[PDB]
Design a protein around this ligand. Sequence first.
Ligand SMILES: [Mg+2]
Ligand SMILES: [Mg+2]
Ligand SMILES: [Mg+2]
Ligand SMILES: [Mg+2]
Ligand SMILES: [Mg+2]
Ligand SMILES: [Mg+2]
Ligand SMILES: [Mg+2]
Lengths: 322, 201, 101, 162, 305, 132
Amino acid sequence: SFFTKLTADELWKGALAETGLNRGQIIGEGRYGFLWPGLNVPLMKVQTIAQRSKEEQEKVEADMIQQREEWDRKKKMKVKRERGWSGNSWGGISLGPPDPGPCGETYEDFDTRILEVRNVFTMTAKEGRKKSIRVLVAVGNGKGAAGFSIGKATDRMDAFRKAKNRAVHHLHYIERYEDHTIFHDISLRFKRTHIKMKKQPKGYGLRCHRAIITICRLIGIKDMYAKVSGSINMLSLTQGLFRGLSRQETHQQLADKKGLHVVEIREECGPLPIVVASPRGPLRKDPEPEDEVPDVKLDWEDVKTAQGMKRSVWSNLKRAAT
Amino acid sequence: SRYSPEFKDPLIDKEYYRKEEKYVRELKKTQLIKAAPAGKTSSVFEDPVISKFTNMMMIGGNKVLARSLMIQTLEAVKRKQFEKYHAASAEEQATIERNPYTIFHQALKNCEPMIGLVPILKGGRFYQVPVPLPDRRRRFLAMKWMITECRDKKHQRTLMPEKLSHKLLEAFHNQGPVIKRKHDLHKMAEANRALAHYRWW
Amino acid sequence: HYVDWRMWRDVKRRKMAYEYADERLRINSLRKNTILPKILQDVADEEIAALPRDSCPVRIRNRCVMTSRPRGVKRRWRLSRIVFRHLADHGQLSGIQRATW
Amino acid sequence: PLPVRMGYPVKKGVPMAKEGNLELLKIPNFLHLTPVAIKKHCEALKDFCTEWPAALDSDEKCEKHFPIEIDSTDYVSSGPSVRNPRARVVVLRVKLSSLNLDDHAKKKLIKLVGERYCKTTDVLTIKTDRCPLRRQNYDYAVYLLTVLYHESWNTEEWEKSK
Amino acid sequence: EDFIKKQIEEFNIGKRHLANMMGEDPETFTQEDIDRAIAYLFPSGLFEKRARPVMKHPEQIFPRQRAIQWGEDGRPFHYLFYTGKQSYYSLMHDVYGMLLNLEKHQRWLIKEELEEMLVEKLSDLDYMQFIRLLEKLLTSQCGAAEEEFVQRFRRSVTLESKKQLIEPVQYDEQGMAFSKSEGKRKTAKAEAIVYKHGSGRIKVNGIDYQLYFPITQDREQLMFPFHFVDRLGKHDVTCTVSGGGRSAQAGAIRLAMAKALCSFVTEDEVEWMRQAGLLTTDPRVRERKKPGQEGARRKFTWKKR
Amino acid sequence: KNRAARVRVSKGDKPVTYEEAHAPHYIAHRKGWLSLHTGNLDGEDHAAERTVEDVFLRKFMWGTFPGCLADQLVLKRRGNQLEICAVVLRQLSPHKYYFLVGYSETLLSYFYKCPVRLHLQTVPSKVVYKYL
RNA sequence: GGACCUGGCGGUGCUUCAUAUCCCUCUAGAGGAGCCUGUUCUGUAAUCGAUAAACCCCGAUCAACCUCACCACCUCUUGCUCAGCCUAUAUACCGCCAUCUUCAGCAAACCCUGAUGAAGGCUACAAAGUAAGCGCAAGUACCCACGUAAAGACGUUAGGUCAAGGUGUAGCCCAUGAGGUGGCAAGAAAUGGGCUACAUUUUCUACCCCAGAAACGAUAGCCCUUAUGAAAUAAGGGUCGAAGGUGGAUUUAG
Ligand SMILES: [Mg+2]
Ligand SMILES: [Mg+2]
Ligand SMILES: [Mg+2]
Ligand SMILES: [Mg+2]
Ligand SMILES: [Mg+2]
Ligand SMILES: [Mg+2]
Ligand SMILES: [Mg+2]
């Protein structure tokens, strides 16, 4: 019947079952070919109750069908999701720059790349298991400034957006040799992750953990080696890395501490002593006491490498640029 | 109830209004007050105990009948007393009280049990522990027991008011089923002397 | 274009009743007496029996107009206690308000 | 022109504004029939209105002059049809003392007419519910009354067996 | 603020229009009249009076806020801004200062009202503290200014319902003082006519009370108020009764009788009567039956099993 | 959990109108009746007939005016009249609306033998009461 | 495997409370009898659904035919419908409910503590929380501000319902569609909830509360009318005149 029918929204709801269509048709459109002065025909005036020919109506129908098909095609169109580490993982994939502040204060210089996405569950009283998303996000702009965050929420997008904002608010500065490197070799134990980073020359690339690479890129660090030992909790790794980058002396700082001149002597260049950082003020006339055979509790792996005793097949592998 | 907590209960006895007290009066004046319920009356003749008894008797909320029955019992008692006294036998003023109300009161007094048994579980078994009853409870027991005796059914075709009257008479000089029951209860209590330490109050 | 087959059947029955009602009434009148002969009465009864079923007024069942359901149907509105309720709640029946009481 | 705000206020807000409320629409409204307007209308309609004579208040004078009281109603429902049966009915309340032409017929009329005729106030009250139209019903009632009166006046032979 | 101002003007205009429309011609006319007009010509008829159609001066309608606590170039106006809930804090400080001054020298608000006064949202504990402070101040023994300040918060109540309203005395046909009064009880209305003087009996609907009431309890009830007074047999009464059953009717009559007596009995006696509870309409009436239950409160059986 | 007309709190996003945002228990209290006719008074006749008509009319209106009804209609009757108050969006051209309206009036009139004269209420957006 | 976090549970400790609720206490009931009507199990060629609290005079504000879906027999095929289906999925759903609820919480959006772990965020002489929004409350109805209605969010239970209506998906489409005639329900039993008693506070008659008699109970049928209706389920009258002679463990309501 007619009274047994009902509104569309309800029907749609019924169809969907997400609780455990009228674009194409124009207000004058008909199955039968007809032409009314108000709609379908020109606005009022031709002014007569005309009807379409069979052929014309058929043509119209065909056109409509074509339009529908086109729409369907449009709907069913894959957009190219950039491949972050692994296709089907929220790895190095980029979110856009973090949304602007309350007063204004835009962050168009900054870029946001994800580091992990975990579906964290919690058993609550009446609700049962609550599927929350937890996301580790980093922020950086090049130029040495960067930070990170652990936004968590019931939705993914929400989590991302919180996280980006958090990152924007919590930034470290990371001093760099030139644009391209760490000032020196770092050895930091964070909780149970050990990270051994080595300073390298230009054209070495970033040969470190994928996350570590991404973070470096974000920072502005362009080329260096890093070994990640112990556990590999992502959060621990990230935080530890950040700490390491914060706590490395500049050459200027060193100079200040010691007097003296921080003079680098390259093998690439000649014997020529290049002075990097001299002290802003006085100069200590007593030279450093070169107490020979210096006690530095040094790593075994490095020693092995130097010697050639260890030869793992997964070490010097040809990889894609960074 | 449809009276608010603002509303307080009405003190009815009119000898109270025939003279801290002043303060109380003032307070009352300041406050609102409940209406006087039906049975509790201004009259000189009203006896509260008797009213209570009548209420107890009442079944199916048909009060008038109950009242009538109560009246009849009293009448019967009076008649009995007169028989004992006036024409038949000697005019023994001392041994025969004629006031039925007084007799009733005496009976009630007699019927009061100064100990009662509470059931208390311990280990996994039920013990009948003796307890000192408050006066109100005792009073209730008195009347209720009497009423149940009257009801019995072993007395059969006999009407109520007569039977009740008889019971009252029996009570008056320490006889009858109610008194026996009371005595039995007492005996039981005595038997469970030792279980007074099971009680925690 | 009625709600279901039952509804249609009911409608048909109603129509039949409307068609043959007067005659039925007459026959009942003829029957229901102590006045006048027995043979005549018998004949009348026979005639009534012969007359087709569904023209019978008692086979007319009440349903809701909207949903074809036989029970919970208020005869004031001719709709079911579900449909009626639905109507009421949105506020599409004048007068009908919830009994706060 | 009025800035009327019609609706229940939101927890920390205002009653809903004038320019898009269903509630206002729902209200049956008296924007027409402003007192002045009403007065004007009345003035306009002082024609159509022949004032009634000095037959006086208290209903005594009227009774003396006009006996009989017919009084039929008529209901004004909504919707496309106007056919309401209840409207057709008519009663005819007439005072028996005001009839003033009966001696023995007073004794007979009452006998004839059972549940009608109140004794506290001598009022015959025939009610006509038979025919469909109102006017015809009224006519019937009138006729009924007249015939009844005639019957009362014209005594029969069998009467004597009292 | 601009918007509000605009609305004010618009409101005024609307009012003027309304005035023009209605028979009351002047542009100056009261709020009550306006309300009446609105009722007449937008008759909602809804039970919620807030949901009814209204138009007023929008300074009554809108809930105002403390707009702009800092000017241009930051710098908040009031010195206790960074506390938050600043006004309350300021008030507290002032109170403290006053107390100190006093020391050197030698009913209450409700939370909602306080909030309204201030503008800021205020918790219960804070309110309590404030009250305590006020109390302390009061205790102190103060000058006039302090008293005035205190009064700003403290608001009166009006105490009602203590006396019984004494009816007239009236004389009809002959010189006889006769008091009319009326009582209801349990769907049973009464109307008693007590005559002062005229010693004897009570007529209920013409019939004498002895015949109208066969039962002793009802008789007692009828007697009651007179007995209480002490003026037992000194008044004749005619009493129209209607509705309900026996006992209820009797109760109603008693109530009415009491009321009548109030008319010409000493005020102290009236007070006593009131205290004793025979001048108050008992609002105990048969409870509505519910559609889940067998009776008004008794429910159908195995709810637990 | 009774859940008849009352629209459900999912988030703070759902824009809801005043009639739509009020539960059935408010009908006399904070709301009004949409339809208005004598039938449901007592004693009085022809309620059932009216109800069906009312049901039809709203549906018809919805069909005619697609995405051009902001809120539910108000049906009124005065003897032999059938007035309608539709709150419409300012979406389509006025000419089209005009064309529609007359047609509706004629068609409805011919159906029910009752002079209809509906009056529209142009409002640019749905008048939000709550963001539920 | 270790150590946490959140929950759930503990015949888990302390403290404080349930004012018809947990006990003692009250009052009237059920369980014993006959019926009335539901369920189960049985019977039948013959529905379906609900089926611990939260089913069991429940969907039904009603099954003689109808209703109706069920079963037997006999027909119909563009068929009331631009078909139809009370066919399968309530574990696809909307809609409309139950439930804890006789309760006060649930929340977006921020911020902080956890070396930035799952998480947590209480101290007014205040130690880090702030909050729109929904709920309680407040307003409303009814005989008031009391009471009772109504209201009661998020979730719980894949709780109830495809047979109220609508519909996703999957099927039947000379049949799981449609129409006709007849029929189908009766208890060896078990159990739930009613009614009525078992008598003297009673039974009958008057009167509707001062009376006079008596020393019950009222089905089951049996016949006979009456009402209804095409057709007998109800109502009355005669007749008969069961069991029962205050109910066990237990449990229901106020
Ligand atoms: Mg892949
Ligand atoms: Mg509920
Ligand atoms: Mg079928
Ligand atoms: Mg409720
Ligand atoms: Mg509330
Ligand atoms: Mg299930
Ligand atoms: Mg199921």
